Structure formats: C-alpha cells, structure tokens
Amino acid sequence: KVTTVVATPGQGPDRPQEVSYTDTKVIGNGSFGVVYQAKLCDSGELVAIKKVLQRFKNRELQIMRKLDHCNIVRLRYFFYSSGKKDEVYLNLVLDYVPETVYRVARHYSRAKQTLPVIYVKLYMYQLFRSLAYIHSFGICHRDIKPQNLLLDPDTAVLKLCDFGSAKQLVRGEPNVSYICSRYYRAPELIFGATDYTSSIDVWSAGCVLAELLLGQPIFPGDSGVDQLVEIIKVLGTPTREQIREMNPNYTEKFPQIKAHPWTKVFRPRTPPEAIALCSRLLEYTPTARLTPLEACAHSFFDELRDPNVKLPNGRDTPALFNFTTQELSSNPPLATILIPPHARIQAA
Amino acid sequence: KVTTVVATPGQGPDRPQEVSYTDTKVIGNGSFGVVYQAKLCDSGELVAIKKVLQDFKNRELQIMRKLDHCNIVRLRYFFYSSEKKDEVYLNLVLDYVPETVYRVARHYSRAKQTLPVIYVKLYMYQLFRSLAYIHSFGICHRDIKPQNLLLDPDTAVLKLCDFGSAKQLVRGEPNVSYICSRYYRAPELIFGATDYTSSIDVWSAGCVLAELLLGQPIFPGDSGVDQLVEIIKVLGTPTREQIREMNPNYFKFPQIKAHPWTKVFRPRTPPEAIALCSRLLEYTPTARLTPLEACAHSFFDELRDPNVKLPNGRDTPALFNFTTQELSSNPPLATILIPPHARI
Ligand SMILES: O=c1c(O)c(-c2ccc(O)cc2O)oc2cc(O)cc(O)c12
Ligand SMILES: O=c1c(O)c(-c2ccc(O)cc2O)oc2cc(O)cc(O)c12
Question: Which domains does chain A have, with CATH numbers?
Fold first, then answer.
C-alpha cells in the first residue's frame, strides 16, 4: 500500500513536492497523537511519522525547521492532514532510530551490570554536542531524559528527539516552571523560577550521566517537595545565595542537611573524571554549571580523543569531531582541545 | 495568621459558609496548580488545599461532591479565588494524609526489603474497597498508581486521592486512549480502545500489588509499543480473541510464551498473593476480578480473622463497614465481606 502526500522538505527551499511512503505501521500513541513507522518509496529508507493534532503556529515545527545536526533526529518532511470537522494534523517525517538510552540502561540494570564507561562517554558526549548546537539558537529542549535519546545499536550514534517541549528562551519573557520530566527537573524549576535559562538542560544532562553511572535514576522524587528532598540528600541544603540565583523571587520549607561527598554517591571503582564532571553539571547555581561545549572538552571525554580508541564490538567510532560553527560559536578556541591533530581536516 | 474564605461543603446542602484556617504551607506545585497544607481554626484539624486553575464545569469537583468513603480523600469544602491574571482557581479542601505508597515502597526498596505481607494485604484491601465504591457510581479513577495512594502510617489507613483524571464512563460515549500512568496502563488502552470500562483501574491495582511483591514496577515500559512488549514478556502474546476483547476495532509484537507467575516473584512470595495478581493482570477485561470480588478474595482471609492485629499491636482500621452502595455490584458477597464477628 502506497501513500502520496504533498510535503515540504525539512531543510532547503520552502517548496512543497510529492512524497510517497509504504509499509505504514503504528509504533506508538502519545498525548500529542500517534507515531508511525514507514518506508520512503524513493530511497527505501525507514522513517518515523509523528502525527500531532494542531489559534497558534506549531512551536515544534518552527524549531525543527531550523535544526540540522548529526546528533539530532532530522525532520525530513512535514505535511498537513485532517481528522473530525476543523481538526488539522501536522505530520513530521523524521529519521527512524531503533533504540533508546532508556532501553539500553534498563537492559544493563536487569542484568545487574553497569554500562561500560566507554558507552557512557560516547552517549553523553553526543548529547552535549546536540545541546551545544540547539543552545546556539537560544533553543532550550526542556525534556532531556533517557527516553528522548535515540540510539542506533550498531554505530553507537545517539540522536536527540522530541522537540514538543522545546522553546526559544528570550531574556525578560517569562516561562513555565513545571516543565521537564520530574527526576531530571532542574532545582530552579522546583523553586518556581520563570526567568530560567538553557542551563536547565545541562542539569538534566547531569542527571542522565549520574543515572548511567549508578544503574538507576539519581533523584527518584515523589510528587511535592520530595523531589527537592532527594536532591538535598546529595548536594545538601542550598544556601540563601544559591536560592537567590535559582529564583530571585523565591517565595519562602525543606530540611537542613550537609552535602554527601560525590565520591561516596557512586560505586567504588567509578572513574574520578566521571564524578568530577557530574559535580560540575549538578550545581544549584545555574551560571556555575558547565556549558555543553565546555562539557565536551572535559577530561572525562579524553578517551574519545585518543587516536587508538575502538568500540567493544571492534566497529568504528561514530563521528565525534565534525563540529559545526553553531556548536563552536560560544568558544571557538576550544576547538584545539576538542579536535586533536589526528582528527583535524587538513589544508590539502 | 488567619485566612477566612466563603466555602460550600463538599457534601450536604449547597449552602456557602465561612471557613477559617491557619498555618498555610505549600506542599506541592503540579500541572493543575498548587497544593497547600493548612489547619482548620475551630477544630485544629490538618487539611490539604488543592488549588486548580479552572475555566465549562470542573469534572473533578462534580465527582468529588458525590463521594463519602473511609478509603477516599474526602472533599470537605470548595471555594473560588484568584496567580494567573484573569484566571479563577477552584480550591478543594481535602483530608490531609502524610505518606504515600510510593514513598513507603521506595523506603523498603532502598533497604533491600519488601513490604511485610500484612501491609500488602491491608493496603491492597483498602484500595479495592475504594475502587468498589467509585465504580458503583460508574466513576473510573484512571490514574491508580503508588503516588495517588495516601497512607497514614500510624493507623495503616489508606486513602485514594487525585480525581484529576477521573470520569463517569458511559457505554457508547468515547473516552481518550492515552490516560493512566504508563507503567500502570491497561493493555486495552495501549491498543487504543475508546470503549473501555472501569476494569482499567483493576489492571492498575494489579500492577501496584505486583510492585509491592517485587520491590519495583512490574512493567517499566519505554514510550510506544515497548510497554506492551514488557507486558508480553510476562503474560505471553495475546490471542486474536484476547485482542478483540480489548478492542473490537483494529503493532509488531513477538510471539512469546507466557512466563509462569510463580517464577515472576521471589521464592517465598505467598501463593495467595500470586493467585490474586494472576486474576487482576489478565488481557481480557471481563476476566479480571471486579473490585468487590477482589476484596472478597482468599488472600484477604487473614484480615477477616477476629484475632488479626497490626504488627505494632494496634487494632486494624475499619474494614467491614460496607454500605449498600459499596455492595451493589454483588450484594450477596457481604456474607464474606462482613464477617460474623463484625455483624450486629
Ligand atoms: O489530590 C491531591 C493531590 O493532587 C496532591 C498533590 C500534592 C502535591 C503535588 O506536588 C502534586 C499532587 O498531585 O496532594 C494531596 C494531598 C492530600 O492530603 C489530599 C489530596 O487529594 C491530594
Ligand atoms: O520525536 C519522536 C517521537 O516523539 C517518538 C515517539 C514514538 C512513540 C511514542 O509512543 C512516543 C514518542 O514520543 O518516536 C520517534 C522516533 C524516531 O525515530 C524519531 C523521532 O523524532 C521520534
């Protein structure tokens, strides 16, 4: 069965064209609508088709049309379709990716093993590249969690997906505080900040890292203040200064506790660079957190810059040094750390 | 610091009156708005105040106004107020309960222990009674999960809360497919059913029981079809008939044999717990026990023993004060549910 629609390509000229697809199968339902898998007839490539029910322009579409990066799911095409009367659906044709960081972590947890640190480095590094890319546009993802990090098992390529929560943060324009997935929600958000920055994604990324080291979510909070209590149980109670920086409008009730040492949080053999990276991502003070490009340059990722590095299956490392000007724009001189001599494109 | 508002009683004649409270503290911010704890002035009772942004009559209010049961958070009063500029907020004054099943289960998990069996019996029994009461009005909760089961640790009383997803189900009137919390979501929902019934709450209850026996969620699915794959890894692949029963309208899932229930749980798991769980977690919605049937299941036999006592030595909470409303799905079951020693 072949379906043909008029669609606009995600990138390039804003010109509609005929696109045809087959082997249409539902791969999930959601609050937004339905997601299908299908095969493009022209190339034969697998794609996902996210069908979203639409007063306002679709923010997810506006954000997605601007993005093209190796560590983000690419919007191939979009097109409109109809459902009841006056119901309009936006259809996003996206790269298909079979696995997630959530499923890989769950596999290891069930086998009572932690993910080898090399995979933790590979996944986190790619996530940081994706964050550096989107943050350059002022776009904050606001839903960083293992479920939204797609993986191709063979190549170990990670791609960030689900821009349904994403927003361009503009200084002085307030934003909703109840926004990320709860275990990954930055403390400023729990304190009711509406003037928060993209650094909320970095906290989320820190939670993912810690999770991949621990074998389970580091802050598995219940509803209410209990999420904040879980955080305090590791970082300790925030000072009044830290509270001010998180939310200058903080409306005054949590327990007073001293920080548990980071080294004691993780398993005894956890590499010290991993703990050091976590401690620089999971800071109460939003401005104290590493930027994504600074995270990529951290010594925890030194192994990925070693010329002799191979994946456990013997297959080639995925692309790690094809940096874009978007990613490098916050600190171009850091490219001498990030891209070692063996990976440097040569003058020829 | 005393606040005074004009509020209508949740139940009773709809006559506004003045209510005063002190010691207001925020205990939570959610998608709906804010939840506070406060102390009623004249009586000194701790209450919760759940402030919901409103617009169209509030479903949750309409539902809570019909309910009065020992295992359900009671709506004492409701009033209106004003965060959002032009926006009206509904305020529900509710029973306050300090703990949740989520927090108690996490406590035992971090200790590498499981909840003692008597508490599994007490909490699951109280859940089933709460479900029997609401189902008798045709009301489906649609968000049964450990977070929504409040616990008083001293009395072992359980109370169901958060009627935010609840709806009166009416045959022939369609309902949304994507509704419970994912780990507790019934398989007909995953298959996009719109003509489902109250039995989706019983599935959820089965997931809660399985979690209390296991020490973790039984089906921790990823997004999409992976949740069904999790279920299939235990119940085995559903048959054509089972699929038709879940949804007689209209996925790639593997053809796997069912895993035996006794192997799913740890070796000294009480066999009556496993038998109860196998009768809740069934593909076919009609094959699941109804809540009243569940309350009467033999796993709860120990609770009907006149010598039963809590481990702290205290007497068990009210278990047998069944009303006509509560018994109405199968009134004859009262000969089991009200033991001779509890009768007049
Ligand atoms: O409905 C409740 C609720 O949504 C919540 C709730 C509280 C905090 C939060 O962050 C989210 C919640 O759903 O708490 C309750 C506490 C009570 O004692 C009684 C209740 O009915 C609730
Ligand atoms: O954005 C995606 C998505 O929301 C989902 C998704 C799928 C099923 C579901 O139940 C919920 C989802 O968010 O899947 C994707 C798969 C891809 O290969 C690429 C994507 O961008 C998505």
Answer: 18-98 (3.30.200.20), 99-344 (1.10.510.10)
The identity of residue B254, as a single letter, is P
Ligand 1 atom closest to the Cα of residue B159 is 19
CA dihedral B305, B307, B312, B315 (to 10 degrees): 80
Q: Do A29 and B177 touch (CB under 8 A)?
A: yes
A222 and B100 in contact by Cβ < 8 A? yes
Q: How far apart are CA B106 and CA A84, in angstroms?
A: 44
- Is the Cβ–Cβ distance between A88 and A98 less than 8 Å? no
Any idea what DSSP says for residue A105? H
Cβ density class A306-319: b for 16+ within 10 Å, e for less: eeeeebeeeeeebe
Active site residues of A: 143
Cα-based angle B142, B146, B148 (whole degrees, multiple of 5): 55
Nearest to B209 by CA among B144, B140, B120, B103: B120
Using CA atoms, how far residue A112 sits from A105, A108, A120, B247, in Å, is 11, 6, 16, 37
Rounded Cα distance between A243 and B182, Å, is 34
Partners of A100 in beta bridges: A150
User: Which residues, in sequence order, are bridge partners of residue A173?
Assistant: none
Dist CA A36 CA A49 (whole Å): 5
Span from the CA of A35 to the centroid of ligand 2 (angstroms): 6
Rounded to an integer, what distance in angstroms lies between the CA atom of residue A82 and that of residue A104? Answer: 37
Pair of tokens at residue B234: 């235990």
**CA-wise closest residue to A59 among A27, A32, A30:** A32
Q: Which residues of B touch A224 (CB under 8 A)?
A: 27-28, 35
**Active-site residue identified among B23, B42, B95, B143:** B143
CA distance A150 to chain B (A): 12
Ligand 1 midpoint to CA A138 (Å) = 35
CB contact under 8 A, A223 and B147: yes
Name residue, tokens 């009044």.
A240
Residue type, A34: V
Distance between CA A130 and CA A323 in Å, rounded?
11
Interatomic CA distance for residues B286 and B223, integer angstroms: 27
Distance CA A67, CA A78 (A): 14
Please say whether the beta carbons of A105 and A146 come within 8 A.
yes
Q: How many alpha carbons lie under 13 Å from residue A99 in its C-beta half-sphere?
A: 15
